[PDB]
Amino acid sequence: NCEHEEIHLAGSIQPHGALLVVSEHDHRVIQASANAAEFLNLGSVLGVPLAEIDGDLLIKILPHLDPTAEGMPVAVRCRIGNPSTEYCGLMHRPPEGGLIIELERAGPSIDLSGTLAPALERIRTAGSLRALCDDTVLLFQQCTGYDRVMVYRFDEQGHGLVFSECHVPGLESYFGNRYPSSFIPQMARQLYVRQRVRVLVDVTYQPVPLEPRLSPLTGRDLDMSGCFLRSMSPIHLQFLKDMGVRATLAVSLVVGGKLWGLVVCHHYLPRFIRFELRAICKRLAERIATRITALE
Numbered sequence: 001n002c003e004h005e006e007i008h009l010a011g012s013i014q015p016h017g018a019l020l021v022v023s024e025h026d027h028r029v030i031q032a033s034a035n036a037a038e039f040l041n042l043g044s045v046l047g048v049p050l051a052e053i054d055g056d057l058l059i060k061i062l063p064h065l066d067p068t069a070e071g072m073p074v075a076v077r078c079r080i081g082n083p084s085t086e087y088c089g090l091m092h093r094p095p096e097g098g099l100i101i102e103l104e105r106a107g108p109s110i111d112l113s114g115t116l117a118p119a120l121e122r123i124r125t126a127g128s129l130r131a132l133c134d135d136t137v138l139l140f141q142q143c144t145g146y147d148r149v150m151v152y153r154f155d156e157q158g159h160g161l162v163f164s165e166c167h168v169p170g171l172e173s174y175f176g177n178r179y180p181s182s183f184i185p186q187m188a189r190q191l192y193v194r195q196r197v198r199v200l201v202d203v204t205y206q207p208v209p210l211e212p213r214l215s216p217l218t219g220r221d222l223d224m225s226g227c228f229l230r231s232m233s234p235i236h237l238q239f240l241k242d243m244g245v246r247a248t249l250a251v252s253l254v255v256g257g258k259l260w261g262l263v264v265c266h267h268y269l270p271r272f273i274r275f276e277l278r279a280i281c282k283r284l285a286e287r288i289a290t291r292i293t294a295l296e
C-alpha cells in the first residue's frame with residue numbers, strides 16, 4: 001500500500017453537515033467546520049460559548065463531561081439557529097482536542113416497518129455463506145435504496161472479492177470482480193473496525209476545511225476517526241469517480257476483531273442516510289457477522 005495516508009487527519013468535512021469542537025473546561029467552540037455558521041443559521045460560531053449557540057444543547061452535553069460516565073457516542077435532538085431548525089447532534093470525544101459535535105439536519109427518514117421483516121426472515125434461513133451474503137445484499141438494498149449493493153469479502157490473501165451483488169436492472173454487475181489488497185489499506189481497515197459506517201453523499205464534494213486547522217488544544221491535526229462527516233481519501237474518491245459512482249454507503253463486517261469484509265453500496269446520484277438508519281445498518285451488519293463467524 002498505500003499505508004501512509006493519515007486518513008483520520010483529514011482536516012475537513014463533507015458539506016452536508018456541520019462540525020463543532022467544544023472545550024471541556026470552558027464550553028466554547030474552539031474549532032468548527034468553516035460552513036458551520038451558514039449551516040446552522042448563526043452569525044458566528046468560533047469562540048462562542050455553547051450557551052450562546054444553544055442553551056438546551058449545553059444542558060444535554062454537561063453530564064457527558066463526567067469522566068466516570070461519559071456515555072458517548074450519543075445522538076441528541078436539538079434545535080439551533082435563528083430561524084430555528086431541528087438537528088441530530090452526533091457527539092463523541094476523541095482522546096484529545098475537546099468534544100466533537102457533528103450536526104445533520106433532521107429530515108424525513110426511510111420507513112422499514114413493512115419491508116424489513118421479510119428481508120430479515122430470508123437472512124435467518126440462510127444455510128451457507130453464499131446464501132447469507134446474497135441475502136445480505138438484498139436486505140441492505142431493500143432498507144437503503146442504493147442502486148448497487150455488494151458484499152466485498154477479503155480472501156485468504158487479503159484480496160478484495162465482490163462476493164455478492166445486487167443492483168437495479170440495467171446497471172453494470174461487479175459480481176466476481178477481484179481487487180488487490182492495497183485497494184483497501186490496512187490502516188483504513190483498522191479504522192473501519194472502529195468506525196463501522198461511512199456515508200459519502202457526493203463523490204465530487206468540495207471539502208469544508210476546519211477552522212482553525214490545528215486544534216488549539218494540541219497544536220496538531222484533529223483526530224477525526226470518529227467523525228461521520230470526515231472527508232475521505234482523494235485516492236478513493238478518484239477511484240469512485242473513474243467508475244462513475246456518485247455516492248456510497250459502506251458498513252463494516254467485523255469478525256475476530258478484524259475486517260472480514262464490507263457491505264458496499266453505490267448510487268449514481270447523491271445520497272444520504274440519516275442517523276437512525278446508519279445505526280440500524282451497523283447493527284444488522286454485526287448480526288450478520290455473528291453468523292459468518294459461525295459459518296467458518
Ligand SMILES: */C=C/C1=C(C)C(=O)N/C1=C\C1=NC(=C\c2[nH]c(/C=C3\NC(=O)C(C=C)=C3C)c(C)c2CCC(=O)O)/C(CCC(=O)O)=C1C
Pocket residue numbers: 001002005007152160162174179182183184185188198199200231232233235236239248249250251262264
Ligand atoms: C494504493 C492505495 C489505494 C488504491 C490503489 C485504491 O484504489 N484505493 C486505495 C486506498 C484507499 N482505499 C480506501 C477505501 C476503500 N476502497 C474501497 C475499494 C472499493 N470500493 C468499491 O466499491 C470497489 C469495487 C466495486 C472497490 C475496489 C472501499 C470499499 C473502501 C472503503 C470505502 C468506505 O468505507 O466507504 C481508503 C480510505 C478512504 C477513507 O476512508 O478515507 C484509501 C486511502
